[PDB]
């Protein structure tokens, strides 16, 4: 069509698009397979169309640094709009340009290492809860699906960190927080709805005037009311995500609806993501028990006699840092990094026209043989103390990079590591007969396993 000749004029290789559809039919193998395929068949830079939207993929480390870090505030500042957002347009991950710079300033101190150290005791409290509910499942003599145990854990930390709500999600699935928040699963961008709106971006403004929100509106209105009630209910900082935005509420000021929007994004950002990575980590520990043994030995060394973890101790365990990093290399759940080019610009000898989405194939780079030897093998020694300097930080980007990287990286890493320390110091995980030995990945818009990971759990 009239927008499909762009990459031909610039002389950029890519699959030939179809009218009205672009290359979305090539998504039948999934985002990951499509990205790795184009990397093999086109080299270091290629292009394709999500409907009428042109997308340029870049793999040069210098270009990635220019897009994500150097020319970030000037050119590559925002992400592609993804659908009808409603009042959630004020969320930090959805805000654009000056509003984003303001909100990120108003929210950066919330994710300081100092504030994270003050959050460790609260998160550790539900590590003991996870172990208690894990032992009962171990006594059943039957395999357990890790998504439910970790999802229960990830919910308990989120509620206790975002608010003061202490809950046992696995045993108390009735509290209004547990019910509504359990409907904040990740967005399958290859489903009929999202595939439709990428082909029909003109329908996004229509959906907004019908008050059709991409987030379930019942959960949003419930959460807005609960925050409005809790603000009066405390009208003892307790290292509370909501409180840290209330005391900071008194650049510019953070509004009440803005505060509500950020709180929901933190719940959304850390419920399935935390549980998914924790499930991937345990799968690789079962199929590679030598790693699990050394990790279980390192946990006992730093924290003897099943000692509770600490900010100073978690940041000390080196082999635990290797297991999370290598799992995030194999399974970067974002799969991709996107920036919208807001003006004509030339980067590293390449012309990027206005309006083109620049894409960085994190999954494709993480499994590229030109940077990783035996990429499919899960060798956690890639990040040893003497081999962790060879890795290019712009090829391995599990949390993104630049001033729009993950704002909750330290929390997520701490939260996951605190969970791993407590569970491996009491249990061992064995591959049962209901476990997929190859672990086929899903073909949709999510980086999740095809079948849920079920493993045998024994007590130590
Ligand atoms: C293991 C879990 C997580 C992973 C793998 C992850 C990864 C990412 C990635 C790749 C991005 C995009 C950065 C880019 O565009 O360059 C991002 C953005 C973001 N993440 Fe996470 N994330 C995780 C958990 C969390 C959690 C628990 C929070 C809660 C505070 C959080 C808050 C955010 C925010 C606020 C952004 C948007 C930053 C901005 O737009 O300025 N993330 N994350
Ligand atoms: O933005 C992402 N997630 C996200 C989205 C929302 C929102 F939609 F409601 F606004 C809210 C929270 C998060 N969230 C999850 C973990 N931390 C932040 N990404 C990366 C990404 C995706 C697409 C384009 C792009 O440039 C960057 C992500 C991260 C981990 C797993 C899966 C994803 Cl899709």
Curated annotation (Swiss-Prot):
Its cofactor is heme. Pathway: Steroid hormone biosynthesis; Cofactor metabolism; retinol metabolism; Steroid metabolism; cholesterol metabolism; Lipid metabolism; fatty acid metabolism. Its EC number is 1.14.14.1, 1.14.14.56, 1.14.14.73, 1.14.14.55. GO terms for biological process: aflatoxin metabolic process; alkaloid catabolic process; androgen metabolic process; cholesterol metabolic process; estrogen metabolic process; lipid hydroxylation; lipid metabolic process; long-chain fatty acid biosynthetic process. CDD domains: CYP3A (cd20650). The keyword Methyltransferase does not apply. Changing residue 327 to M: In allele CYP3A4*11; unstable form. One of its GO terms (cellular component) is cytoplasm. Changing residue 196 to P: In allele CYP3A4*2; exhibits a lower intrinsic clearance toward nifedipine. Its main location: endoplasmic reticulum. It is linked to Vitamin D-dependent rickets 3: An autosomal dominant disorder of vitamin D metabolism resulting in early-onset rickets, reduced serum levels of the vitamin D metabolites 25-hydroxyvitamin D and 1,25-dihydroxyvitamin D, and deficient responsiveness to parent and activated forms of vitamin D. This is Cytochrome P450 3A4. It comes from Homo sapiens (Human). The gene is CYP3A4.
């Amino acid at each position: 069509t009239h927008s499909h000749g762009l990459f031909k004029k610039l002389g950029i290789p890519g699959p030939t698009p179809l009218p009205f559809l672009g290359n979305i039919l090539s998504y039948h193998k999934g985002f990951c397979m499509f990205d790795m395929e184009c990397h093999k068949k086109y080299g270091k830079v290629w292009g394709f169309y999500d409907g009428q939207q042109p997308v340029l993929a870049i793999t040069d480390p210098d270009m990635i640094k220019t897009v994500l870090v150097k020319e970030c505030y000037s050119v590559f500042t925002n992400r592609r709009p993804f659908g009808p957002v409603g009042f959630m347009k004020s969320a930090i991950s959805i805000a654009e340009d000056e509003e984003w710079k303001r909100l990120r300033s108003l929210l950066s101190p919330t994710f300081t290492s100092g504030k994270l150290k003050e959050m460790v005791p609260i998160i550790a409290q539900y590590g003991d809860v996870l172990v208690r509910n894990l032992r009962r499942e171990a006594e059943t003599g039957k395999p357990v699906t890790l998504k439910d145990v970790f999802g229960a854990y990830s919910m308990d930390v989120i509620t206790s960190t975002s608010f003061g709500v202490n809950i046992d999600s696995l045993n108390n699935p009735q509290d209004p927080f547990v019910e509504n928040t359990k409907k904040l699963l990740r967005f399958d961008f290859l489903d009929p709805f999202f595939l439709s709106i990428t082909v029909f971006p003109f329908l996004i403004p229509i959906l907004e005037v019908l008050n059709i929100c991409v987030f379930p509106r019942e959960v949003t209105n419930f959460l807005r009311k609960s925050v409005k009630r809790m603000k009066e209910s405390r009208l003892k900082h307790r290292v509370d995500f909501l409180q840290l935005m209330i005391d900071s509420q008194n650049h510019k000021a953070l509004s009440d609806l803005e505060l509500v929007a950020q709180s929901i994004i933190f719940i959304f950002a850390g419920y399935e993501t935390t549980s998914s990575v924790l499930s991937f980590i345990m799968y690789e520990l079962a199929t590679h028990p030598d790693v699990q043994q050394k990790l279980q030995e390192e946990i006992d060394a730093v924290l003897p006699n099943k000692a509770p973890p600490t900010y100073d101790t978690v940041l000390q365990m080196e082999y635990l840092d290797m297991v999370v990093n290598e799992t995030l290399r194999l399974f970067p759940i974002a799969m991709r990094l996107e920036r919208v080019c807001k003006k004509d610009v030339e980067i590293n000898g390449m012309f990027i026209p206005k309006g083109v989405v620049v894409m960085i194939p994190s999954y494709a780079l993480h499994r590229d043989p030109k940077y990783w030897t035996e990429p499919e093998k899960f060798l956690p020694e890639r990040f040893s103390k003497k081999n962790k300097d060879n890795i290019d930080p712009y090829i391995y980007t599990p949390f993104g990079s630049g001033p729009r990287n993950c704002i909750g990286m330290r929390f997520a890493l701490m939260n996951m590591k605190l969970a791993l320390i407590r569970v491996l110091q009491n249990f061992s995980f064995k591959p049962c007969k209901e476990t997929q030995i190859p672990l086929k990945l899903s073909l949709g818009g999510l980086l999740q396993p095809e079948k849920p990971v079920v493993l045998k759990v024994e007590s130590r």
